[PDB]
Amino acid sequence: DEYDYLFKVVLIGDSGVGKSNLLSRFTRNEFNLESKSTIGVEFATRSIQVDGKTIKAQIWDTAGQERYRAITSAYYRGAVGALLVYDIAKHLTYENVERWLKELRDHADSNIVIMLVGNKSDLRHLRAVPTDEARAFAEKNGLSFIETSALDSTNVEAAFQTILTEIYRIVS
Amino acid sequence: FQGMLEYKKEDEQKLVKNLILELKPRGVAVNLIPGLPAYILFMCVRHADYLNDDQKVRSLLTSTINSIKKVLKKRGDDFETVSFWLSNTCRFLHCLKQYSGEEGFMKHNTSRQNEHCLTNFDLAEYRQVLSDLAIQIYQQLVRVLENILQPMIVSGMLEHETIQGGTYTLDSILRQLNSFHSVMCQHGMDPELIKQVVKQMFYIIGAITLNNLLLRKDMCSWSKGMQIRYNVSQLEEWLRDKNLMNSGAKETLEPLIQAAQLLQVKKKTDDDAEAICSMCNALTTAQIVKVLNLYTPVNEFEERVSVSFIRTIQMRLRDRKDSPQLLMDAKHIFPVTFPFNPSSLALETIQIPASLGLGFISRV
Ligand SMILES: Nc1nc2c(ncn2[C@@H]2O[C@H](COP(=O)(O)OP(=O)(O)O)[C@@H](O)[C@H]2O)c(=O)[nH]1
Ligand code: BEF
Ligand SMILES: [Mg+2]
Fold first, then answer.
1. Which long-range contacts (CB under 8 A, 24 or more apart) does B133-139 make?
2. What tissues harbor this protein (chain B)?
3. How far, in Å, from the CA of A131 to the mean position of ligand 2?
4. What are the CA-CA distances from residue A89 to residues A122, A124, A128, B3, B245 (Å)?
5. Domain definitions of chain A by residue range
6. How far is the CA of A37 from the centre of ligand 3 (A)?
């Protein structure tokens, strides 16, 4: 297949927030209730259309764990986009967003496009992170914002579509 | 029309020559519908059976099998040739079963198709000959594709670095795979056969890549592990795009995947050891220990795998009862199972184009 742009996008956030299922939902429309902690680094691609151009998303995935700095550097290297993910039903994962933002600033290009993603929006009855609170943090820190559900697929396409479009605005 | 084909006894060699010996796979009339030579051949058998001519039945079937063997002996190293005649031999076998007159092979037949069944001859023995012939053709197909893929694997799967963001690359392998698959599809090869061929190709890719890991220290780092995992992910996505996720091809890569994972994971604590043992169930103890031994870091702040850690691994993998295998047999061929795929094609509707050069054949 052919493409006009190749955008490396990385997924970051606490273990269990749903990074790998966001990947699987977007790239192959699949979801796993029993997905286990990601081993090493995983990869998946999908091409979309932006402004009449074919943009190939190259999505990197890894566990929200501590690792050798060199591996982290390789993970972020060349990334033009990042999904910073937390669990709307787990406030601790939202509290740790600052930590992942710090890792981002330490390793990523200064012009990387960052979207704050509140995943598991299907768990409405268990919400621990107010939408307004997270959106306000995102806006304050120069991040895009969206709430997704990898489970029922809500806003998953829109999330990737938006961040890939914002990257395109910068690099085209 | 009856759905048979009549030919003079003096034109039998002429029949097998144009339809089998000198027939081109890329023929325009041949690419209208798949298995056309197989259908034409069988339509002649029906007439022989209808004529109760046991001598003609014997000669034609003998001329057919020997003509197919001849093409594959002459044009032996051509993928398209082998692929084409594997498809047509199987279809010729399909016809002999579908129109055998045996109830077990006529469950999907129409009323008119049953009227086309053989009435005078039991060709059960001849079907066995073709079945064994089909096995030999498939064997030959695998050898040809293996000879093409083998030189590309090491360079494309390991040596060519792209994870940081002429000789063969991953795209080279991907393109070759596409060519193989496209050819088999064009010939209308049985889907069960195509899937088994793809599985065979992926095993070859996996085994050769994994064997090089187990033989080279300059390939055992976390960076190479990431590269290998990405390369495999590309192969997986190719499978998905071609609707081959049930071919078994992906599962053959599982030892390679776990080796790539082993290169990436932590290798120090007892928890790391337990994680490795639980993770590498598709690798043997010898293979796991080997990779840990060959693990040669390329950065400063990271140490080599200690002897204490390796002992811990061997201790945990003591109670496992697995194969003693170290290097894999990259030449191994999985035993092929052949399907029986009868078609809805109406023999009485099949016409013979003039470009085939078979005008001497009368349509009965
Ligand atoms: N209810 C719900 N559960 C989810 C969603 N996304 C992921 N999960 C579950 O959360 C668990 C962790 O998912 P995973 O993708 O492996 O988290 P990761 O460590 O960030 O990759 C899994 O059991 C998933 O089934 C979602 O949108 N809604
Ligand atoms: F555990 Be997840 F993969 F971060
Ligand atoms: Mg994960």
1. B133/B65, B133/B68, B133/B69, B133/B89, B134/B86, B134/B89, B134/B90, B134/B93, B134/B338, B135/B336, B135/B338, B137/B68, B137/B72, B137/B82, B137/B85, B137/B86, B137/B89, B138/B86, B138/B193, B138/B197, B138/B336, B139/B333
2. Detected in melanocytes.
3. 23
4. 9, 8, 5, 70, 34
5. 1-172
6. 5
Residues A96, A86 contacting (CB under 8 angstroms): yes
- Nearest CB among B240, B264, B299 relative to A40 is that of B264
What are the residue ranges of helices labelled H in chain A?
19-28, 69-76, 91-95, 97-107, 131-140, 156-171
Resolution in A: 2.1
B276 to chain A: closest CA residue: A39
CB-CB contact of B144 with B333 (8 Å): no
Chain B contact present for A71, CB below 8 A:
yes
Greatest alpha-carbon pair distance for chain A in Å reads 44
Technique employed here was X-ray
Q: Determine the length of chain B.
A: 364
Contact (Cβ atoms closer than 8 angstroms) between residue A11 and residue A60: yes
Cβ atoms within 10 Å, residue B53: 16
Q: How far from chain centre, in Å, is Cα A83?
A: 2
Tell me, which fold does domain A1-172 have in CATH? Rossmann fold (3.40.50)
3-class secondary-structure state, position A86? strand
* Contacting residues of A for B281, CB less than 8 Å apart: none
